[PDB]
Amino acid sequence: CHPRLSLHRPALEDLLLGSEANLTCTLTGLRDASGATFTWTPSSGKSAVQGPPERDLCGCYSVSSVLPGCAQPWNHGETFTCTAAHPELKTPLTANITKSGNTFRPEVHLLPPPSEELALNELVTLTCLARGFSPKDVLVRWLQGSQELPREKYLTWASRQEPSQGTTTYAVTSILRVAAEDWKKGETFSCMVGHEALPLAFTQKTIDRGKPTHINVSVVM
Amino acid sequence: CHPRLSLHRPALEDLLLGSEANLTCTLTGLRDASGATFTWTPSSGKSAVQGPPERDLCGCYSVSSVLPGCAQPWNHGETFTCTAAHPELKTPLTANITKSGNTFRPEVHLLPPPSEELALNELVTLTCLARGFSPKDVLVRWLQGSQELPREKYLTWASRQEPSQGTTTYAVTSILRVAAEDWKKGETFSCMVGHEALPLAFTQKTIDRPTHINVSVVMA
Amino acid sequence: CHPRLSLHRPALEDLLLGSEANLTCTLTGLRGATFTWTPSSGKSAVQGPPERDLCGCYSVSSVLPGCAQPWNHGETFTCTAAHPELKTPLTANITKSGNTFRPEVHLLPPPSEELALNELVTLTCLARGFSPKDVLVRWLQGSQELPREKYLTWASRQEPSQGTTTYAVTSILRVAAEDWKKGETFSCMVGHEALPLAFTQKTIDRLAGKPTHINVSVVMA
Numbered sequence: 190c191h192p193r194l195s196l197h198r199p200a201l202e203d204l205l206l207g208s209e210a211n212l213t214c215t216l217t218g219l220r221d222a223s224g225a226t227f228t229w230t231p232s233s234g235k236s237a238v239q240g241p242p243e244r245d246l247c248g249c250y251s252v253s254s255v256l257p258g259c260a261q262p263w264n265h266g267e268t269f270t271c272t273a274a275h276p277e278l279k280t281p282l283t284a285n286i287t288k289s290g291n292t293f294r295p296e297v298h299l300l301p302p303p304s305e306e307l308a309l310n311e312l313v314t315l316t317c318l319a320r321g322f323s324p325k326d327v328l329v330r331w332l333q334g335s336q337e338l339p340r341e342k343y344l345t346w347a348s349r350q351e352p353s354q355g356t357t358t359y360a361v362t363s364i365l366r367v368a369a370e371d372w373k374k375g376e377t378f379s380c381m382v383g384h385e386a387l388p389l390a391f392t393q394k395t396i397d398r399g400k401p402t403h404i405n406v407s408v409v410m
Numbered sequence: 411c412h413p414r415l416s417l418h419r420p421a422l423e424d425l426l427l428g429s430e431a432n433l434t435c436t437l438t439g440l441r442d443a444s445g446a447t448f449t450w451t452p453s454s455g456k457s458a459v460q461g462p463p464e465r466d467l468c469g470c471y472s473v474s475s476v477l478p479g480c481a482q483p484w485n486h487g488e489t490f491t492c493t494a495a496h497p498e499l500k501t502p503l504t505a506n507i508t509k510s511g512n513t514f515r516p517e518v519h520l521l522p523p524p525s526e527e528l529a530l531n532e533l534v535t536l537t538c539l540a541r542g543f544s545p546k547d548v549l550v551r552w553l554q555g556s557q558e559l560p561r562e563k564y565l566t567w568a569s570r571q572e573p574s575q576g577t578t579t580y581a582v583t584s585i586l587r588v589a590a591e592d593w594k595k596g597e598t599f600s601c602m603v604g605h606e607a608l609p610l611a612f613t614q615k616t617i618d619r620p621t622h623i624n625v626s627v628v629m630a
Numbered sequence: 631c632h633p634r635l636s637l638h639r640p641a642l643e644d645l646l647l648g649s650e651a652n653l654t655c656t657l658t659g660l661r662g663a664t665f666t667w668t669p670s671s672g673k674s675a676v677q678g679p680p681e682r683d684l685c686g687c688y689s690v691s692s693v694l695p696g697c698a699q700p701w702n703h704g705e706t707f708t709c710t711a712a713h714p715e716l717k718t719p720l721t722a723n724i725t726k727s728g729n730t731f732r733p734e735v736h737l738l739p740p741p742s743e744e745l746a747l748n749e750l751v752t753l754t755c756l757a758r759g760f761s762p763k764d765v766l767v768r769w770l771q772g773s774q775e776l777p778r779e780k781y782l783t784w785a786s787r788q789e790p791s792q793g794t795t796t797y798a799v800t801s802i803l804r805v806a807a808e809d810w811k812k813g814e815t816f817s818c819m820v821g822h823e824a825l826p827l828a829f830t831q832k833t834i835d836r837l838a839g840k841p842t843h844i845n846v847s848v849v850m851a
C-alpha cells in the first residue's frame with residue numbers, strides 16, 4: 190500500500206476563460222521530512238513553488254509542485270517532465286505528460302418540454318445533452334436572453350464514457366427548471382458547452398416555443 | 411490512526427427484483443478475521459445469515475456482521491444496531507441506525523429525438539428522466555418491444571441533489587442509442603423506474619412518431 | 631524630420647484566441663535609440679529589425695511581449711523613449727477601458743424576393759451598442775468554421791444617439807440554394823471584450839420565417 194507519482198493537466202476553466210495555467214506534481218502518504226525535492230526538467234526561469242503543508246489521513250503529509258505560465262507551451266505541443274527525490278524515498282522517479290491527440294467535436298442538443306407537465310403549468314424542464322467528444326473535459330453554462338444565470342440554478346452530472354463501436358467517446362447532461370409565466374410569455378434560454386476541440390472554444394444552442402403552421406381553408410356556397 | 415463509527419443503510423437494490431435478505435453495514439473502522447455474525451438485539455426470526463470472509467490488512471479489515479430480517483420488519487420504523495467486539499476495541503462498539511420516512515414518488519417523463527439529428531439517419535437518441543424525491547437510489551432498465559435488455563447497451567448516471575425550493579429532492583437521467591430504420595418502422599421503447607413510493611414499484615411510458623390542415627364547407 | 635511617439639493596445643484576435651499578446655511602442659524619425667518600460671515584468675523586449683513610410687522618415691518599433699494577464703488585471707503601462715534628436719525623453723501610456731457595454735446580436739432571415747431565382751440566399755448579421763470599438767465576426771456551417779475568404783464584414787462606425795457613444799458593425803454571407811432547401815443550419819459569432827464568456831452565437835435554418843397560421847376563404851356567392 191504505497192502510491193507512485195503521476196502528473197495532472199491544467200484546469201479547463203482557467204485554460205478557456207483566459208486566466209492562467211498550472212501544472213501539479215504530487216506524492217504523499219507518511220508524515221516525513223521536508224526534503225521533498227521537486228525538480229522540473231523544463232523550466233523557463235520562474236520554477237515551481239513547493240506548496241502548502243497539506244495533510245491527509247493518519248497524518249499523510251502532502252506537499253506539491255506547481256508552476257505558473259503554462260499556456261503556450263502546453264498548447265503548441267511540448268512534453269513536460271517532473272522528477273523528485275525524498276529523504277525516505279532517495280530512489281528518484283519521473284512521470285511525463287503530453288497534450289492529447291485524436292480529437293472529436295461534440296454535438297449539443299436542447300430539448301423542449303414532457304407534455305404531461307406542459308399541461309400542469311407548475312414547472313418545466315429543459316435538458317441539455319452533449320455527446321461524442323474525445324477527452325473527458327467539458328464546461329456547461331446556462332443563460333437567459335443575454336444574462337448569465339448563476340451556477341446554483343441547475344445541476345450537471347459527470348461525463349461518463351459511452352459504450353459503442355471502436356473508439357472511446359463521452360457524454361454528459363444537465364437540466365434546468367423555470368416557472369411557466371415567462372415560459373409562455375416568450376422568454377428564451379440557452380445552453381453552452383466548452384470543449385478544446387472546437388475552433389472558437391464554445392458552442393451555444395437556444396430554444397423557444399418549434400410548433401407547426403396552421404392552415405384554414407373554407408369554401409362557402 | 412482511527413477505529414471509527416459511521417452511519418449506513420440497507421442497500422435497497424435487493425427488495426424489488428431481489429429475493430434475498432441481508433443488512434448492509436460493514437466494519438466500522440477495524441477488527442480481525444471472523445465468521446460474519448456478531449450478536450444484535452433480535453429474538454425475531456433467528457435465521458441468521460453467515461459466510462466467512464478472508465483476512466485483510468493495510469489498516470482496516472474486510473469483516474462484517476450481517477444478520478437477516480429485511481422486508482418483514484419493513485413497516486413502522488425499527489432500528490438495527492451494528493455490533494462488533496474484536497480486541498482492537500477499547501469499548502463495545504454498539505453503533506446505531508435511524509430510519510426516516512417522507513418518501514416521495516418519481517415524475518417520469520420521456521420525449522422525442524431531436525429534430526436536426528434526423529437528417530443523417532445513423533442512430534436515434536432517447537432520454538429518460540426521473541426526478542424529485544427524498545431517498546437516493548433508483549434503478550432503470552431499457553426495453554425494445556416488451557422484454558427488458560441486458561446491461562450492455564445503455565448508460566445511466568448517478569443521482570444528484572437537485573436545486574429546489576422548499577423541499578429536499580433529487581434527479582437521475584439515462585440515454586439510449588438505437589438505429590434509425592427500426593425507429594422508422596414504428597418500434598416502441600420503454601424505461602422502467604423502480605422506486606419504493608410506487609404501489610407496485612414499476613413505471614412505464616412510451617410514445618412514437620404532424621400537420622394541422624382542416625377544410626370546411628358550408629352551404630349558403 | 632519630425633519626431634513622434636505612440637502606443638497600441640493588444641489586438642483582439644490574440645487576446646481572445648491564443649494568448650500571446652504583444653504591446654507596441656513606435657517612433658517615427660532618424661532623419662541608435664533606446665526604450666524603457668516602467669512595469670518591470672522580467673522579460674525584456676526586442677527592437678524593430680526599422681522600415682520606412684510615407685517617402686520620408688524611417689520609423690522604428692519595439693515590442694514588449696508577454697503582457698496578457700496584467701492587461702486584463704487593470705494595470706497601467708508606460709514606455710519611455712530616448713534619441714539624439716530628442717531634447718527630453720518622450721513618454722506616453724495606455725490603460726484598459728472603463729465603463730464598457732456589451733453588444734446585441736441579430737441574425738436576419740433572407741428576403742422572400744430572393745428565393746424565386748434559385749441562385750444563392752443571403753444572411754445578415756448585425757451587432758449594435760458596444761462601447762470599445764473592437765470586435766470579431768466569424769461564420770459557420772453546422773460545425774465547420776468557414777474560411778475568411780467567403781464573406782464580407784464592414785468596419786465599426788459610431789451610431790447617432792444622445793445618451794453615450796456606441797458603435798455598430800454588419801456582415802453578409804451568401805450560401806447556395808440547394809444547401810438551403812435541404813435544412814442545413816448556419817451560425818454567426820461575435821467576440822467582444824465586454825462579454826462575460828467572450829463569444830455569443832445565433833443560428834438559422836429554412837424554418838422560423840414561415841408564418842404561424844394561414845386563413846384562406848373562397849366565397850362562391
Ligand SMILES: *[C@@H]1O[C@H](CO)[C@@H](O)[C@H](O)[C@H]1NC(C)=O
Pocket residue numbers: 721722723724725
Ligand atoms: C497617463 O495617462 C493619464 C490618463 O490615464 C494622463 O492623464 C497622463 O497625462 C498620462 N501620463 C503621465 C502620468 O505621465
